[PDB]
Amino acid sequence: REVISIHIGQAGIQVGNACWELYCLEHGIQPDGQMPDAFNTFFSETGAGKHVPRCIFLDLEPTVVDEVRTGTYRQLFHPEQLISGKEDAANNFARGHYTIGKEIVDLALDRIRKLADNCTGLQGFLVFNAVGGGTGSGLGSLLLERLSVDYGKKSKLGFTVYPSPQVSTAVVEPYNSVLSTHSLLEHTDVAVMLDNEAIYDICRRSLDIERPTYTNLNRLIAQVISSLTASLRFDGALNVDITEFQTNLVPYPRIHFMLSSYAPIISAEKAYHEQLSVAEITNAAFEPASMMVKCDPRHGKYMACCLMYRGDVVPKDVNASVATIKTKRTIQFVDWCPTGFKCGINYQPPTVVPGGDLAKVQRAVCMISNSTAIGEIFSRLDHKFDLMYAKRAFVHWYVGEGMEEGEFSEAREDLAALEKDFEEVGA
Amino acid sequence: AAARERYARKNEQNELERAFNTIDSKGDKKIDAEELTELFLRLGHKPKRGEVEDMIWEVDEDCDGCISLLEFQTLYTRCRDDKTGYEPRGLFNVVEFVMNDKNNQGFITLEEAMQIMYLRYGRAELDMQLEQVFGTADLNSGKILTLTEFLHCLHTNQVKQLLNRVTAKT
Amino acid sequence: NVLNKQRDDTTDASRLTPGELSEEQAYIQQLQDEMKQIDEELVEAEAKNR
Amino acid sequence: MREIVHIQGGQCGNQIGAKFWEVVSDEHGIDPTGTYHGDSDLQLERINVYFNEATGGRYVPRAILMDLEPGTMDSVRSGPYGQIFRPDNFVFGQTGAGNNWAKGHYTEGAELIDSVLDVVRKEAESCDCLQGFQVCHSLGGGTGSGMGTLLISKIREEYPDRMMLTFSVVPSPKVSDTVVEPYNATLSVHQLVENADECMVLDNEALYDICFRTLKLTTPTFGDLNHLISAVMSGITCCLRFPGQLNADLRKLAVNLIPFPRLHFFMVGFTPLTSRGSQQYRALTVPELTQQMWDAKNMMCAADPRHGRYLTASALFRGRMSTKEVDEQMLNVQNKNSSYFVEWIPNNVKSSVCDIPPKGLKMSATFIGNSTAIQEMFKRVSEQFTAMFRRKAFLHWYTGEGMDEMEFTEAESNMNDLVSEYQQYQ
Numbered sequence A: 001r002e003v004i005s006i007h008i009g010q011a012g013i014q015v016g017n018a019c020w021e022l023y024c025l026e027h028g029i030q031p032d033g034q035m036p037d038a039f040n041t042f043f044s045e046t047g048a049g050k051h052v053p054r055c056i057f058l059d060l061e062p063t064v065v066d067e068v069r070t071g072t073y074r075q076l077f078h079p080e081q082l083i084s085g086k087e088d089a090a091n092n093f094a095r096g097h098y099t100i101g102k103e104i105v106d107l108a109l110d111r112i113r114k115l116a117d118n119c120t121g122l123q124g125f126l127v128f129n130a131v132g133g134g135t136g137s138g139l140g141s142l143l144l145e146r147l148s149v150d151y152g153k154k155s156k157l158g159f160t161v162y163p164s165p166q167v168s169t170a171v172v173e174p175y176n177s178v179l180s181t182h183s184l185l186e187h188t189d190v191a192v193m194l195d196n197e198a199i200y201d202i203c204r205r206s207l208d209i210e211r212p213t214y215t216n217l218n219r220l221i222a223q224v225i226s227s228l229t230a231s232l233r234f235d236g237a238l239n240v241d242i243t244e245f246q247t248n249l250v251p252y253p254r255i256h257f258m259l260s261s262y263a264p265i266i267s268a269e270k271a272y273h274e275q276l277s278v279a280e281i282t283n284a285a286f287e288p289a290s291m292m293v294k295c296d297p298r299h300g301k302y303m304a305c306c307l308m309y310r311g312d313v314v315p316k317d318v319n320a321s322v323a324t325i326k327t328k329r330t331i332q333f334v335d336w337c338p339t340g341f342k343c344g345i346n347y348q349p350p351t352v353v354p355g356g357d358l359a360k361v362q363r364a365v366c367m368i369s370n371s372t373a374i375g376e377i378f379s380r381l382d383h384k385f386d387l388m389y390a391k392r393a394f395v396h397w398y399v400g401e402g403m404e405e406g407e408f409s410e411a412r413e414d415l416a417a418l419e420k421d422f423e424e425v426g427a
Numbered sequence B: 001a002a003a004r005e006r007y008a009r010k011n012e013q014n015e016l017e018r019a020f021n022t023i024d025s026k027g028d029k030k031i032d033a034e035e036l037t038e039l040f041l042r043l044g045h046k047p048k049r050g051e052v053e054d055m056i057w058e059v060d061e062d063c064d065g066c067i068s069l070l071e072f073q074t075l076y077t078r079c080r081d082d083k084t085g086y087e088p089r090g091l092f093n094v095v096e097f098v099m100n101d102k103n104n105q106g107f108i109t110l111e112e113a114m115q116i117m118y119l120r121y122g123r124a125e126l127d128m129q130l131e132q133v134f135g136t137a138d139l140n141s142g143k144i145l146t147l148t149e150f151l152h153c154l155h156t157n158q159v160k161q162l163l164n165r166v167t168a169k170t
Numbered sequence C: 001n002v003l004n005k006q007r008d009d010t011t012d013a014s015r016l017t018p019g020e021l022s023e024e025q026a027y028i029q030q031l032q033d034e035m036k037q038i039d040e041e042l043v044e045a046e047a048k049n050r
Numbered sequence D: 001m002r003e004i005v006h007i008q009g010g011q012c013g014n015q016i017g018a019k020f021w022e023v024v025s026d027e028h029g030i031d032p033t034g035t036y037h038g039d040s041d042l043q044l045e046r047i048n049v050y051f052n053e054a055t056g057g058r059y060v061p062r063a064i065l066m067d068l069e070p071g072t073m074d075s076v077r078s079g080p081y082g083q084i085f086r087p088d089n090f091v092f093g094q095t096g097a098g099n100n101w102a103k104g105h106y107t108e109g110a111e112l113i114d115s116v117l118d119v120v121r122k123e124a125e126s127c128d129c130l131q132g133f134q135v136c137h138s139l140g141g142g143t144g145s146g147m148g149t150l151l152i153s154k155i156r157e158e159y160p161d162r163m164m165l166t167f168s169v170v171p172s173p174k175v176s177d178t179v180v181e182p183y184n185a186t187l188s189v190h191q192l193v194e195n196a197d198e199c200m201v202l203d204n205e206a207l208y209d210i211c212f213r214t215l216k217l218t219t220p221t222f223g224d225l226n227h228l229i230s231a232v233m234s235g236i237t238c239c240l241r242f243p244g245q246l247n248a249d250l251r252k253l254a255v256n257l258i259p260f261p262r263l264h265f266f267m268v269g270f271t272p273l274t275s276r277g278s279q280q281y282r283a284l285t286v287p288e289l290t291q292q293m294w295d296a297k298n299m300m301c302a303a304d305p306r307h308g309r310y311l312t313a314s315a316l317f318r319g320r321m322s323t324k325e326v327d328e329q330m331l332n333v334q335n336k337n338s339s340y341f342v343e344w345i346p347n348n349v350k351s352s353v354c355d356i357p358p359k360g361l362k363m364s365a366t367f368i369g370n371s372t373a374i375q376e377m378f379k380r381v382s383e384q385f386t387a388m389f390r391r392k393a394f395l396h397w398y399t400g401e402g403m404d405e406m407e408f409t410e411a412e413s414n415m416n417d418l419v420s421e422y423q424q425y426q
């Protein structure tokens, strides 16, 4: 069994820099690539004692790629994997989807083919992108189009960064998010949202870090992915695979948008004075003070939830804890679904990396749920996208690249149709 | 129901004796496996590789080998009164066909006479052995009678009660 | 030059398209017929045993 | 003599069976390396029911492990008594069902069960006179439910005149691991009603409450639940392996316990089950065994028989005991609580005794009761299934893989007539 991870854009490959850091520090591999069998899902073995990750970093701007070529992990990554363009899409979805995308995605495809050929029991792909940019949005959707026509039956775990409601860095990002979701809708099988303001609030309150940079954000994202692949990498008392989430969490082929959370995100000092058990982390995974997307599931209704458990966890209390959640009335599940949970326990605790701000915790929970509060975020995006589109601001850049007015209106009504779809399943 | 059978036997005995002689081709009393194929050819039907051997095997039970007129009446009577006997009927059918033949291609409506003699039965039961309909006639031959009779006997034989039993409801 | 590059790729794509295997589909069809023949052959033999 | 092959499906089936072969081998005196070290001749004379001598005192279990993920199989050969299974018996896919009953019954089943059947066929012809088959699986998973289900159907078509047991845990709303549990349960049971000879209904709630109150355990990992289930399964077959005053084979119990051919789902219990604080303070008598046996909380299913009436009941006792106590205890427990037993069958309890206890205990028991209270479980899952199906939630992995709408309607109809015929016969 193998899974390969592709990274597109500035935010994508930065996230990868934290993930592969965490991976080698977990499996005891130095950054040069040699040990001083469970690593087979992510690293292929040269046979000379060197381990190479199954990943391809690609983007349109060579700046963020070439610090990676000269960091500590210069020798871990195979050179061909770290694809790099010559000029940026520059926060322009059309420029990444038709002008510059059309030259770079074909090189990525004939690369990713031999990664899959080296694999035997490929479980799927998992993609990392931020929709606010042009690279991660434009050629990301283009790459997903060509991936669906190539494989189809294989899972494509989309861990996307949506633009925050209020905290934003770009100004044309409403255009980019709407047009990108229009294709991310019918290509990604399972798409997980990761906002930025929510992670900002977690590091401010939980980690009690008052001055966080992007490093800490990417660090905890890797922690969630590690908690999600431990079931694939290691044996537990009750394991799930990546094909399990395809069935157990998305009731309709167009409702695939999950709210992620993780617990406990605790600094080095609270852990010393605080107690860890299964019941309280089962609680802490549901409160909105620990969610990764600025929305409130208290406003929505749950379809189905998923629960990753790591460390010294027995199965009797995960059942008792999820029972206590159902008997509470702050959160309610959809009428059509009497049972709304998918639980899982694995033996290996989360390892720590030196230099990170995550404590060594005895046990942890990674929750991945599906709800209807996600419908409020998409609607919130439509108000400010439609706000500017009527007066045709910033449209001239995209239409000058080779697009027209047609795709704005047709993409707009498609995501508008999705709004009505979410409201009718909730009833 | 006895009167139909007794009266039928009273008349068919003379037909049967000539039916026997006619099936014989060597002008003797013994009916060899060789003769049976000749008879089927007259009917216009073809035997399979081992059919004749089974046909000769099952009928004879007082000696081994060729058959004799004495065995033939024993077969006739046992098969005729066989009804709930679950007994063999491989060579009964060919002789009953020949005796019930007077047209030298087969018989049409006479199936009903055969049927009523065996039992009053039903029009639907007739739609079981063949597809003959009251108003229409048909053409028939040896091929379509033996095969259907043989299949019906196999169809009845299969059905038995294991978990197919049905008890009155509570 | 770019037109020739594109044309070769189309010819490759047309070559790859799955094509019906006549010499193999008929084998499957013939295999099923023999299978069904043996089922009916089996029921007559079971009747004989009873 | 009479031989039973063992078939374990899915993760739940594989781990249940691993503890089963450990406990059984300890009863017959085979060390983890697979050699004989017992003392009594009574242990060597009846190991042909479950093992085959290979070469030089090598006894290998007559078992077949079957699933869709490599993690379970590796977890078997890692632990002790993991080196005793023949490696050819590890029939094994690679892709996985993903808790999708259609993938376990139509997509992935089509390429594995043929291979599973070759190993199963080899194990049937390896023995002389089969007593039956023994299948351990779940009803909520995919690779245990669907894979084991199609296997059961094909096997009954091949060897129809042979017994068959299915030890199956069922899902319940309080212990809800998967989300599509009702879709899997109702379709799986729809196949069990027309294929299995008799089924033994298990569930995880009862296992949790047995380890809470009776056993008084603090950290009941799955090893203890599997330890409990293994004691029950060894009890049902002790009659074939050891002589006694009143023997009762599998056929004897099924023909005696099943009054109507479709009503073959049982509730199980086991005695004695005592905590370490009270293992010293107790006695070992037949009546002490009987009340702890017929206890409502001690049932190994979360369906209280005292909500309904008993149709038939069975007791398998092990140890040097007096048959008068056996018969008089069954008569007394039926006379005081007379309303809880069905009326148009007198003496609704069949009892048998075997003269060999489990190792470490002086005297044990095993209860197999066919009550009418089981319809609660069928309704408890049926309404959840109808609730989901009336809006087609989670249906595209079912209808997109090969099921149609009439299959779910067939499942409801068969579900509804079974609960209706339980209601009539009660």
Ligand SMILES: Nc1nc2c(ncn2[C@@H]2O[C@H](COP(=O)(O)OP(=O)(O)OP(=O)(O)O)[C@@H](O)[C@H]2O)c(=O)[nH]1
Pocket: A008, A009, A010, A011, A012, A014, A015, A059, A060, A061, A088, A089, A090, A091, A092, A130, A132, A133, A134, A135, A136, A137, A161, A163, A168, A169, A170, A195, A196, A214, A215, A217, A218
């Ligand atoms: N969570 C998280 N988000 C990031 C990080 N770095 C950048 N982003 C997000 O990425 C968005 C813009 O996209 P980028 O990835 O920076 O740039 P791009 O997607 O490659 O598009 P271009 O600038 O045209 O190349 C911003 O809105 C940020 O929120 C990061 O380290 N962590």
Ligand SMILES: Nc1nc2c(ncn2[C@@H]2O[C@H](COP(=O)(O)OP(=O)(O)O)[C@@H](O)[C@H]2O)c(=O)[nH]1
Pocket: A237, A238, D009, D010, D011, D012, D013, D015, D016, D138, D140, D141, D142, D143, D144, D145, D169, D171, D177, D204, D222, D223, D225, D226
């Ligand atoms: N007794 C017991 N039950 C288990 C164990 N592991 C899983 N289960 C049960 O199996 C159900 C989920 O089935 P699963 O293991 O996915 O079945 P499979 O995928 O077909 O092998 C849950 O309801 C659990 O209660 C175990 O080790 N022991």
